[PDB]
Amino acid sequence: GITKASLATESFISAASFQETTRVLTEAAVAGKRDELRGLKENVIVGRLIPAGTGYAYHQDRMRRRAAG
Amino acid sequence: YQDDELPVYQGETTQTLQDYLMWQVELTPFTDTDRAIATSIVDAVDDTGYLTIQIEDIVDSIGDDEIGLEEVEAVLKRIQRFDPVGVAAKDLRDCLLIQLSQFAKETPWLEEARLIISDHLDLLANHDFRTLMRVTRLKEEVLKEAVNLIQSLDXXXXXXXXXXXXXXXXXXXXXXXXXXXXXXXXXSIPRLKINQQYAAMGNSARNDADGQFIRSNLQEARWLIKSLESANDTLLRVSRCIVEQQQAFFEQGEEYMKPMVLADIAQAVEMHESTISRVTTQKYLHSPRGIXXXXXXXXXXXXXXXXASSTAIRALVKKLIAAENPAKPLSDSKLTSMLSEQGIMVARRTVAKYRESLSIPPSNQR
Amino acid sequence: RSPGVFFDSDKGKTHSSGKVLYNARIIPYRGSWLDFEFDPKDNLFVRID
Amino acid sequence: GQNMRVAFMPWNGYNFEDSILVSERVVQEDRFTTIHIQELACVSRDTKL
Amino acid sequence: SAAVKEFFGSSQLSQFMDQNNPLSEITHKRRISALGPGGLTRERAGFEV
Amino acid sequence: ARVTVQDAVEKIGNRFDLVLVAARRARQMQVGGKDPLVPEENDKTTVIALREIEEGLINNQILDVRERQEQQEQ
Amino acid sequence: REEAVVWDILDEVIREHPVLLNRAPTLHRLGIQAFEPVLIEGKAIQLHPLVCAAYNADFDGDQMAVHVPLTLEAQLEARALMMSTNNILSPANGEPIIVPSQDVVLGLYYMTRDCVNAKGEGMVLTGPKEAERLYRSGLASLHARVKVRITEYEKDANGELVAKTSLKDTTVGRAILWMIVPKGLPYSIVNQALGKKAISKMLNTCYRILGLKPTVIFADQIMYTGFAYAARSGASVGIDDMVIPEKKHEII
Amino acid sequence: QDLVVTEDDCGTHEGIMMTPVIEGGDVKEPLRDRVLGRVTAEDVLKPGTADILVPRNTLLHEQWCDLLEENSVDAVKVRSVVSCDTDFGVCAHCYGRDLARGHIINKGEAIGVIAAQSIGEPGTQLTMRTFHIGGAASRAAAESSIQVKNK
Amino acid sequence: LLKFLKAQTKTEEFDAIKIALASPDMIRSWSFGEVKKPETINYRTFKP
Amino acid sequence: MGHIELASPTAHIWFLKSLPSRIGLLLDMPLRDIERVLYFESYVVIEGGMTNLERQQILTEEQYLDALEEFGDEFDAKMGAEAIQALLKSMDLEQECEQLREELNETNSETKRKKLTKRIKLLEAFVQSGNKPEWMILTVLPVLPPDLRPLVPLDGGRFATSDLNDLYRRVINRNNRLKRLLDLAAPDIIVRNEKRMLQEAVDALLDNGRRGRAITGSNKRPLKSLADMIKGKQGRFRQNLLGKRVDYSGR
Amino acid sequence: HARSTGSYSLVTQQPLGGKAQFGGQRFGEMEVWALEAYGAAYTLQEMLTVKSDDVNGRTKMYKNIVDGNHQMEPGMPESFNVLLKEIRSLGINIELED
RNA sequence: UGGG
DNA sequence: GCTGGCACGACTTTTGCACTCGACTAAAGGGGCGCGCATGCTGTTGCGCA
DNA sequence: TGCGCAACAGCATGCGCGCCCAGGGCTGATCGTGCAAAAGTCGTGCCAGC
């Protein structure tokens, strides 16, 4: 029902500005979550290229390096 | 549209802009080391931009490892042209030499006189021409357009500056004279400290929490109020007491000044010297003369039993040497004797230094 | 609003049970305001400031 | 304000939505011209020097 | 002098008069506002009223 | 000038990749060390790249053969 | 010092360099697009009227937002995506947008019509032109039930269009309107009342059949003829324009 | 926003039934606009048995959808999203025809921004609560009789 | 001692930002000094 | 960065309120209880294996003096904020983990699982996280860099001070009062009052909202704390996440 | 107005918003939503970092434009570092990975 | 206060 | 022989750990927190083993 | 049977609430001895140069 949807996401950086920052930073700080920067808003905030459209090409290539080192 | 309290916000002051030469070099098409050498040059540029350190000190401070001076020299001459008509290079010659190179490159009697005047004899021709007119071979007023063109030649830099920090005194402390008495009335007085305590008192009962907060919200706040209102009242009372003590003790309207030992003024209120002398540092005084509550507390024994310190003497000495020398006495000892005729017991040896000090032309006026 | 006595019906929606609640407010020109209210318990209650 | 002679039609599609077209005669006659006045201030203050 | 000069000098019911046209002056001098010290500020209390 | 890009994309349909291919070709002609294979209208090398893609003689494989050929020949 | 040469070099800069436009409360994605600038004399910006409906705004004097793409790949992302000539169908309904309205509906609606008698009735002429009468004198725009010979085109053949002609009954305005219609569009689409429902599905089928460019330039020509002959119409509103029924009073 | 729409063909047989709304006497939406688009799931059958109209998946457009309108088939089984079951994205063939351009969707689509925002663009011009209209103010209808427009 | 740039080395590859609680020792690892007085800047000195 | 050293513990207001807490239910006590007793009052006795009172016993000052005369040694109670540091310091993670695991395995109910489930998942994720329980309270508090709190002096108003700058001089002021008055060997009431004032000072510095909501004299207002100063509106919107003004824009 | 290059703020390294003092207008969230609806990574990428929060992107970008190279060379935003420090003041630790 |  | 620059010496000024001190004070101050919604504490009501 | 156990109902508190665009005025801070030590300034005398 979308009220807990953004709050239940597996990335702590995203949706933190969408709702109260206190509970997100406390639960994430105690849990030790890793964002992995797989979200769109996270790449927009950090400034990295968007993993969609023309960028989806580039982010695909680097992807095959991830598991390959 | 007043928006309540108004913006009143940090604001991120955007002025800065002390030196744009870094942004100028950032656009210069250098190769590799010329950028680092340029950054080494622009760091030594003085705020005036006339004579900056020594050319040898730069190269000695680069950590050369070859890279001879023929390169960094071309970097100097290279940046001086891209500069606002010039920067640094010192020598006092290179400024006027570069200013005249790209300015015009023609007029009657520009380069012909400018090369010799700029090269040599400049300092000899600065005071007056006279016999130099026979050295330059020019005839009578031909050089009038030349020197007249140099006058407009002009500190070389200091064009941008953009220093909004003018540093104003504003209010501080004030005194007034009236009804036969030039007595300061402490003419500031925001009353905010007085008003705030009165206003804050209303604030303490305004929590509207229902938690009462008697233990922390109420007693602590009261303590802070007593603490800041009492401190502001004590500071204002001390400043008013010192302003009245200095007011009554010495009179500005009367000619000359009376020396005050830090102790006499400290002995009037029976307070320690450090406490009052520290209060008189950053606090000024505004009356209907001049524009400091520090120069009016000058202490000196005047080296004589007949009379006042040095302020009276200094003003008087400049008032003496002001109109004097009908011919060309260019004399300090004569001023020390004329000052000694009034019973001031001036040494006449160290007198010239005092007289010379603070823009006085002496003794170089000879 | 002018100072005086205001009899208000509050619209009768509070506990969702559909019970009407009539309150009143005596407001002076200056000083503390005095309010009288009814709870669903059918008892009189007073709210002062 | 100032009166004008109004004609109601489209003219070569130059009027679109709520927009309007004006003749040069209004410009030549000086009609619809205003004057503004701006205050400039410079302060001279006594500094520490 | 600080109380009356503070009230006339700075307040939300005392602002600059509109100098454009006389009618804006007249309708500027005659106006009704729910704001003020007792007041209705904004956002809240804005439906039936 | 090319108003409609649908032809050059109709060559190899993506509409995302034409920015990357025409971008690389736009770097080859824009930077230097290359010449266009189509006569110029005085327009910038961007539209030159779009019309080279619309010509069918420039694609990913062609750029790979040119890159590996010039890299292997040196 | 704005020398005259700087204006020419600036003309060399702005020529094909794209500039993107956006409005302040952008909702859908079509609120921001990328257009080609052309220098104009004035303090304001002239916008294409048909695209205005995409912004859902009107002209009271509203301001705007303008951005200039830098580097290179941004110009390719603006030219290959945000060009309004590149994308027409809005990704919501599927029904086309930028479809003309306002004066164009009056030009095409007043264009297509017939009436009894008036001037010339029917005649026998060769088309599609029919520009020697109305465009000069001797006939009327919406009059006559004018029969003319017209050539059609059929796309049912694969990769090739076949031409077919025949004599049909139509009106002067419709026969002149057929001059704009490219190639293989059927002739039954241009004979209608044109209540903007005809241009909606007309541009829809034209785009879904002939493609992007021919319906872009075709809709553009519809714009020019629509404001041109809409201005030729010269409609007006007045007091006598509105009529109160005589019975109404009694009913009350 | 989080949908990247990465994978092309997930190769699943799951789909959703497609039937007209037919609400009350007057139908609200026809079958054409609902069937048009997406991708056909399984097959479709004319009233004549053992006759297949389409070879499993097809791209529905004016030709094919008009051929369906020429027949008596009242319903079409169509695969769509949430039936894709693919991981970390949405298959390109499961969600087809983003509209805009007249061809199929390709890798890198904007997806859930066109969703959301496509839905969020309306709502400003709506009348919100339409309460109190109640027609002629009468309460419901007393007559339980059923009539028909056609036979 | 020459041709040194700290702006070029300030950019590095980073991925998968983590969040965790802080410990006093690690806080001291970031500590470059201690502030022993509440005062900020002197008005007469115009220096901190 | 910079830092400050308290010499006394605090409650780290960023925790224990902060939506249903990771502290109160971690020690299995009602949140209001810890909230009222964690500073300046009550008892909070710890250990006491030979005492008849419970380890979590909340007993008031009356039973505290009753414990001084009746019990004495083996009864250790800290009325300050250091009681949570010792009691949480002695907490065993593994024994409580397997104890709640076997307790949830043996017994289960409709209200049982929620209480058990939140606690067990929190403890398991906490062990797998690697952080220590005692790190919740802060011994050393870092300070913001100078440029993030620009003074921006004006010629009309001399040196302007930001609203959040005064919190540092306040906490350091009360800290120097507590440290100067601590070694002085004074009565316990005054040092307890100092611990409460410093607690309200640090708690007011970290989180402005709620609590004391300290007010300025001149400008009034709640001012701003680190919680509201994160970015903009206490979102990311204003100064980041498409809040940047770019260049070359319209008008 | 049509701002080109104005003065920059000392905090967050961003331009100002006001006319006469040369505001850069504003670029909001729904605009990033729209640019994500088009699928253009670089067009928004230059506006998020180089044109706003990049200190070196200003000088290096402008230097590449004067020479006609038209190279991006993206850089790390300063506002993200501001958020970093503002979080570091709190007892919460966040750190980049290599 | 005012403009969309 | 006279003038100007410089050196030495005081006393005179500058500077750094230290605590002080309790006020009190009642009046003022805000009211209506538009609203809706979700989650938790507790007390009362209903139902079962023994 | 009554007491004991569990469930449900009521009251409190916390989080939220569109975009863009422009002009105008000011606005908390600092407490305050004594003693000791350091540094600077002022005056006088000596030396050097003309």
CA distance to B320, F65, F66, F68, H142, per residue, from F73 (Å): 92, 12, 10, 8, 93
Contacts of B282 in chain I (CB under 8 A): 43-44
- Helix intervals (H) in chain H: 31-35, 62-69, 114-120
Instruction: Give, in Å, how far the C1' of M45 lies from the CA of J24.
Output: 30
Name the strand (E) or helix (H) holding K38: helix K29-38
Task: Answer yes or no: is B191 CB < 7 A from strand N.
Answer: no
User: What are residue G32's DSSP bridge partners?
Assistant: G22
Task: Answer yes or no: is B3 CB < 7 A from strand N.
Answer: yes
Please tell me the distance from the alpha carbon of residue F26 to that of residue F37, in angstroms, as a whole number: 13
Q: What beta strand segments (E) does chain H contain? A: 16-18, 39-40, 76-79
Please tell me the distance from the alpha carbon of residue F33 to that of residue F23, in angstroms, as a whole number: 16
Tokens of G144: 């006559």
Residue B90 burial (C-beta neighbours within 10 Å; 0-12, 13-18, 19+): middle
Q: What beta strand segments (E) does H60-144 contain? A: 76-79
Residue B197 burial (C-beta neighbours within 10 Å; 0-12, 13-18, 19+): middle
CB-CB contact of B301 with B259 (8 Å): yes
In this complex, is the C-beta atom of G179 within 8 Å of any C-beta atom belonging to chain J? no
Domain containing residue F11: CATH number: 3.90.940.10
Give the residue from B297, B292, B283 showing the smallest Cα distance to B240: B283
Cis peptide preceding K7, ω within 30 of 0: no
Q: To 5 degrees, how large is the angle CA H81–CA H82–CA H86?
A: 90
Per the structure, the residues numbered 171 to 190 in protein chain J that have their CB within 7 angstroms of any atom of strand N are 173
**I47 CA: distance to closest CA in chain B (Å):** 13
CA distance to F15, H54, H59, per residue, from H107 (Å): 10, 26, 17
- Resolution in Å equals 3.7
Contacts of H109 in chain K (CB under 8 A): 39
Q: Is H65 annotated as a binding residue?
A: no
Contacts of K66 in chain B (CB under 8 A): 27
Sheet holding G124-126, edge to edge: G124-126, G147-154, G162-169
In this complex, is the C-beta atom of F10 within 8 Å of any C-beta atom belonging to chain H? no
Task: Answer yes or no: is G64 CB < 7 A from strand L.
Answer: no
Name the strand (E) or helix (H) holding B222: helix B219-249
CA distance to B54, B239, G229, J184, per residue, from J178 (Å): 55, 32, 90, 10
Please tell me the distance from the alpha carbon of residue B134 to that of residue B130, in angstroms, as a whole number: 8
The ranges assigned to domains in chain K are 14-98
Q: Residue F42 belongs to what domain range? A: 1-74
Please tell me the distance from the alpha carbon of residue B350 to that of residue B357, in angstroms, as a whole number: 11
CB-CB contact of K75 with I11 (8 Å): yes
3-state secondary structure of G66: strand
User: Looking at the C1' of nucleotide M23, which residue has the nearest alpha carbon?
Assistant: B226
Method of determination? cryo-EM
Please say whether the dihedral angle defined by the alpha carbons of residues G70, G74, G80 and G85, taken in this order, is positive or negative: negative
Task: Answer yes or no: is G24 CB < 7 A from strand L.
Answer: yes
Q: Which nucleotides of L are covered by protein (CB under 7 A)?
A: 1, 3-4
CB atoms within 10 A of CB B307: 15
| Structural gaps in chain H: residues followed by a C–N separation over 2.5 Å | none
User: Looking at the C1' of nucleotide M27, which residue has the nearest alpha carbon?
Assistant: B202
Give the residue from J90, J91, J67, J70 showing the smallest Cα distance to J79: J67
User: What are residue G126's DSSP bridge partners?
Assistant: G149
CB atoms within 10 A of CB A37: 18
I13 torsion bin: left (phi>0), alpha (psi -120 to 50), beta (else): beta
End-to-end CA gap in chain H: 49
- Mention every residue, 6+ apart, whose C-beta is less than 8 A from residue H42: H13, H15, H56, H77
Please tell me the distance from the alpha carbon of residue K73 to that of residue K70, in angstroms, as a whole number: 10
Note whether E2 contacts B1, CB cutoff 8 Å.
no
Instruction: Give, in Å, how far the C1' of M46 lies from the CA of A3.
Output: 35
Tokens of B289: 């003369």
- Helix intervals (H) in chain G: 4-14, 49-55, 73-77, 103-111, 172-177, 197-210, 212-233, 248-251
Contacts of range B288-291, beta carbons closer than 8 Å, 24 or more positions apart = B288/B177, B289/B252, B291/B169, B291/D46, B291/D47, B291/D48, B291/D49
Cis peptide preceding G128, ω within 30 of 0: yes
CB-CB contact of J54 with J79 (8 Å): no
Q: Which among G58, G103, G236 has the least Cβ separation from residue D18?
A: G58
Beta strand G124-126 with G147-154 is parallel
Q: Which among I2, I43, I44 has the least Cβ separation from residue B63?
A: I2
Q: Which nucleotides of N are covered by protein (CB under 7 A)?
A: 7, 11, 14-16, 18-36, 42-46
Name the strand (E) or helix (H) holding I30: helix I24-30
Residue E46 burial (C-beta neighbours within 10 Å; 0-12, 13-18, 19+): exposed
Phi, psi (5° rounding) for residue G179? -60, -30
Q: Do chains H and D touch (3 or more CB pairs under 8 A)?
A: no
CB-CB contact of F28 with F34 (8 Å): yes
CA distance to B47, H80, H119, J177, per residue, from J205 (Å): 42, 53, 44, 17
Task: Answer yes or no: is G62 CB < 7 A from strand L.
Answer: yes
Please tell me the distance from the alpha carbon of residue J94 to that of residue J116, in angstroms, as a whole number: 15
Instruction: Give, in Å, how far the C1' of M15 lies from the CA of I46.
Output: 17
Q: Do chains H and I touch (3 or more CB pairs under 8 A)?
A: no
Contacts of K41 in chain G (CB under 8 A): 77
Q: Is G62 annotated as a binding residue?
A: yes
Please tell me the distance from the alpha carbon of residue B120 to that of residue B112, in angstroms, as a whole number: 13
At G129, the amino acid letter reads: K
For tokens 């220093």, the residue is B163
Task: Tell me the three-class secondary structure of B332-354, residue by residue.
Answer: CHHHHHHHHCCCCCCCCCCHHHH
Phi, psi (5° rounding) for residue J207? -125, 110
Give the residue from H120, H117, K12, K57 showing the smallest Cα distance to J238: K12
- DSSP 3-state percent helix, strand, coil across chain A (nearest 5): 50, 0, 50
User: What are residue C5's DSSP bridge partners?
Assistant: C26
Q: Which residues of G17-30 are buried (b: 16+ CB within 10 A; e: fewer)?
A: ebbbbbbbebbbbb
Note whether F30 contacts G16, CB cutoff 8 Å.
no
Question: How many angstroms from the chain centroid is the CA of residue K65?
Answer: 17
**Number of domains making up chain F:** 1
Q: Which among G52, G60, G231 has the least Cβ separation from residue D11?
A: G231
Helix then strand count (H, E) for chain H reads: 3, 3
Local structure of residue J83 (DSSP, 8 states): H
Local structure of residue J46 (DSSP, 8 states): E
- Mention every residue, 6+ apart, whose C-beta is less than 8 A from residue I39: J169
Q: Which among K38, K41, K71 has the least Cβ separation from residue G29?
A: K38
